[PDB]
Design a protein around this ligand. Structure first.
Ligand SMILES: *[C@@H]1O[C@H](CO)[C@@H](O[C@@H]2O[C@H](CO)[C@@H](O[C@@H]3O[C@H](CO)[C@@H](O)[C@H](O)[C@@H]3O)[C@H](O)[C@H]2NC(C)=O)[C@H](O)[C@H]1NC(C)=O
Ligand SMILES: CC(=O)N[C@@H]1[C@@H](O)[C@H](O)[C@@H](CO)O[C@H]1O
Ligand SMILES: CC(=O)N[C@@H]1[C@@H](O)[C@H](O)[C@@H](CO)O[C@H]1O
Ligand SMILES: *[C@@H]1O[C@H](CO)[C@@H](O)[C@H](O)[C@H]1NC(C)=O
Ligand SMILES: *[C@@H]1O[C@H](CO)[C@@H](O)[C@H](O)[C@H]1NC(C)=O
Ligand SMILES: *[C@@H]1O[C@H](CO)[C@@H](O)[C@H](O)[C@H]1NC(C)=O
Ligand SMILES: OC[C@H]1O[C@H](O)[C@@H](O)[C@@H](O)[C@@H]1O
Ligand SMILES: [Cl-]
Length: 517
């Protein structure tokens, strides 16, 4: 029945997938690594087990259990290292189609863009691309950091999962009709920060894993050293009831997931106050190998792979994440608690660059400032830095965007054009989860979907968003001296980055040392 129920033979395993009437075949819940359980907890991913029994690929595996989450059979689990492939039904191993490899976000704390459907993008491409998604470890399980982890385990395990998945696609995607020599990686949010790590991995040697990158809302939170995370390891050991054990790591590896989850929770960094808790707690660290340096430094040095880049951000990146500040002091306490090496003087300077501002609906008087400052510090300025850095080497192949899709209910919520709001415009309404009945994507923002989707597909296929852009969409010019496409329903056009934003990014740039970014 492989002429009807598609089977793919990868040698180590054979998977039976699903054929859709859409002319797309799906292979869901394939293993790209061994379950990271027992002794493999807090270790690099290992090869998936060879298995001669037919494997079902008709259903998603669970996503990776993250910070403050609860195990749920089939839904959320430690056993979560799965990869999923969508391909045109007619494609064979000889097809050699461009591959779109999607890396989900979730702040390194959760898997927050999991199981996205590639059917609509494949159909919109006229059936000549392959789409890939996967889960990687997060929270304590993906990002426990200590000399003790590193001496009997591996740092940045969650990013090492991503490396394993990238290598899995390189080794196996040919069997799904993909071209292993034509992979584009696309990261959103923490996945976009991950893309920056993949570009700069080990200092930037091209391992031939991808020929282009989409960086959708960079997320660059504090990136601390191993010694700066010892407090966190010790606290985790305490919370899980493991403090009296001689071998801390062995004891951690014996605890059941429910026990682990007691420590898989946020608390203040040293130097931070009791509230607010940092937005993000378990995080990528400088590990001296995969991650030899801070991202800002590595992109300054040119220590990254020179491939075409599509990179951008929303108008109000910070809106879902910034402290609901009532005062200048609230803004400073928020920043100090997320970047505890900022000085009293640097905090005051932040308040001068981002003063109080217009009142936003449903938020306190200083929330506009909090949100603008945090959006710039953590998302947009990093994105602009990626663009300008890559453009030094490939000025003809670096494209920047600003998403300014206006949704009335976002505006009434005081969140402006929030972080990753364009996701359904890239993948199609319904592809990223069920939309509300009144979603503007089904009404007055419908028209931005074909436009956005076509640019992204075009870049995946040809490394230029213009080649197969939507029929009436404008030409998207490269970064140049700071130029970007504004994506907005009925109002999409090139615009200059204002001198004032470039100045604000130079301000954040002057603070990369205390912020550790
Ligand atoms: C991704 O999105 C596509 C739609 O864009 C989803 O495809 C639809 O999938 C459903 C099943 O969930 C199909 O309906 C089933 O059809 C079979 C075959 O006749 C029948 O046995 C069942 O009774 C049921 O009706 C539907 O035909 C299909 N639509 C198209 C246009 O192909 C797909 O399920 C989504 N994939 C994932 C993983 O969510
Ligand atoms: C046909 C077959 O061998 N399927 C088995 C299934 O019975 C079981 O639920 C699972 C355990 O994970 O292993 C697989
Ligand atoms: C092409 C299209 O979608 N047409 C809509 C129309 O249904 C609606 O009356 C109008 C409201 O201003 O917006 C436009
Ligand atoms: C082999 O795969 C089959 C089918 O999924 C499964 O039943 C079985 O548990 C696997 N065997 C081992 C030892 O992993
Ligand atoms: C923001 O603070 C104001 C006043 O303290 C309050 O009424 C509102 O509920 C808060 N909003 C959020 C998003 O927490
Ligand atoms: C875009 O223009 C179309 C056609 O006039 C309309 O349906 C839609 O409401 C407009 N959307 C916005 C946000 O203006
Ligand atoms: O499995 C049979 C299946 O074939 C196809 C569809 O048209 C369905 O209506 C039907 O149920
Ligand atoms: Cl067959």
């Amino acid at each position: 029945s492989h002429n009807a129920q598609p089977v793919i033979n990868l040698g180590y395993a054979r998977y039976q997938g699903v054929r859709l009437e859409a002319g797309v075949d799906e292979f869901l819940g394939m293993r790209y690594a061994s379950p990271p359980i027992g002794d493999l907890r807090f270790r690099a991913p290992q090869d998936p087990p060879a298995n001669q029994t037919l494997q079902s690929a008709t259903e998603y595996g669970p996503i990776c259990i993250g910070l403050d989450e609860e195990e749920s059979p089939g839904d959320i689990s430690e056993d979560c290292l799965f990869i999923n492939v969508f391909k045109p039904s007619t494609a064979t191993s000889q097809s050699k189609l461009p591959v779109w490899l999607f890396i989900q976000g979730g702040g390194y704390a959760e898997n927050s863009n999991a199981n996205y459907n590639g059917t609509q993008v494949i159909q919109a491409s006229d059936d000549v691309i392959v789409f890939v998604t996967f889960n990687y470890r997060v929270g304590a399980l993906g990002f426990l950091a200590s000399e003790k982890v590193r001496q009997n385990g591996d740092l940045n395990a969650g990013l090492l999962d991503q490396r394993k998945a990238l290598r899995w696609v390189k080794q196996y995607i040919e069997q799904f009709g993909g071209d292993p020599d034509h992979i584009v990686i696309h990261g959103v949010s923490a996945g976009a920060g991950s893309v920056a790590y993949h570009l700069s991995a080990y200092g930037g040697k091209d391992e031939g894993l991808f020929i282009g990158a989409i960086v959708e809302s960079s997320f660059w939170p504090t990136q601390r050293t191993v010694s700066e995370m010892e407090f966190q390891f010790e606290r985790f050991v305490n919370d899980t009831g493991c403090s009296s054990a001689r071998d801390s790591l062995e004891c951690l590896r014996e605890q059941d997931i429910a026990t682990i989850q007691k420590g898989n929770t946020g608390s203040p960094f040293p130097g931070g106050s009791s509230s607010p808790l940092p937005d993000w707690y378990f995080l990528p660290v400088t590990d001296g190998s995969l991650v030899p340096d801070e991202l800002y430094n590595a992109f300054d040095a040119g220590n990254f792979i020179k491939v075409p880049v599509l990179v951008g951000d929303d108008t109000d990146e910070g809106s879902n994440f910034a402290y609901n500040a009532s005062s200048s002091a609230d803004v400073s306490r928020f920043f100090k608690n997320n970047y505890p090496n900022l000085t009293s003087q640097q905090l005051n300077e932040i308040n001068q660059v981002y003063p109080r501002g217009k009142l936003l609906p449903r938020h306190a008087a200083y929330f506009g400032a909090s949100s603008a400052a945090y959006g710039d510090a953590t998302f947009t300025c990093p994105g602009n830095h990626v663009a300008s850095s890559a453009a030094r080497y490939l000025p003809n192949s670096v494209w920047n965007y600003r998403v300014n899709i206006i949704d009335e209910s976002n505006i009434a919520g005081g969140i402006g054009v929030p972080h990753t709001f364009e996701l359904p415009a890239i993948f199609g309404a319904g592809s990223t989860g069920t939309l509300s009945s009144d979603s503007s994507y089904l009404t007055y923002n419908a028209a931005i979907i074909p436009v956005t989707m076509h640019y992204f597909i075009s870049f995946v296929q040809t490394l230029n968003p213009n080649t197969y852009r939507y029929a009436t969409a404008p030409e998207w010019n490269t970064w140049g001296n700071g130029q970007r496409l504004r994506l907005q329903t009925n109002d999409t056009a090139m615009e200059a980055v204002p001198e004032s934003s470039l100045q604000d990014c130079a301000f954040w740039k002057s603070l990369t040392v205390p912020m550790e970014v």
